[PDB]
Amino acid sequence: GMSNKFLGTWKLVSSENFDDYMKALGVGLATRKLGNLAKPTVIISKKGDIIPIRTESTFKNTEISFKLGQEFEETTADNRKTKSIVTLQRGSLNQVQRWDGKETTIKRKLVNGKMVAECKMKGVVCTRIYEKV
Numbered sequence: 001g002m003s004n005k006f007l008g009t010w011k012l013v014s015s016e017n018f019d020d021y022m023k024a025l026g027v028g029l030a031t032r033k034l035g036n037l038a039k040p041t042v043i044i045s046k047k048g049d050i051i052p053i054r055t056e057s058t059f060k061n062t063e064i065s066f067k068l069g070q071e072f073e074e075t076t077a078d079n080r081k082t083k084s085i086v087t088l089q090r091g092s093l094n095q096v097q098r099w100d101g102k103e104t105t106i107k108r109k110l111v112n113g114k115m116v117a118e119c120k121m122k123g124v125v126c127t128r129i130y131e132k133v
């Protein structure tokens with residue numbers, strides 16, 4: 001299952017290409033400006049076979065909880081209503097969100113103790129790096 005090394009509180013320390021990623025999602029200008037200024041905290045925990053992931057920022061908070069491989073309803077930070085699935089692939093926690101015939105993937109993996117999130121939407125790739133705190 002998911003490595004226990006994922007468990008904990010993570011703080012964003014770097015974000016590359018988030019603006020174009022948000023544009024690809026259809027996020028408006030004012031929202032993107034605040035999104036680009038946000039430095040969220042991401043909290044990953046485990047309750048039995050349920051995995052909650054909570055995101056906290058001054059602008060927006062989100063929370064999802066899921067079992068691996070089981071589709072669930074998700075409300076995203078930009079208020080998309082998606083059907084989502086999280087899978088585990090070579091130690092990577094891979095989230096796919098589907099809505100209105102579109103899809104985006106968020107892949108989270110551990111790299112030298114940091115958590116690296118890769119966000120992909122229509123060929124646009126955003127990389128966000130988190131430190132454990």
Ligand SMILES: CCCCCC/C=C\CCCCCCCCCC(=O)O
Nearest residue numbers: 035038040055057060077078117128
């Ligand atoms: C996660 C960002 C929370 C608040 C800032 C975002 C503002 C508007 C929503 C547009 C971004 C929606 C996609 C967020 C993907 C975050 C992936 C991650 O770093 O965990």
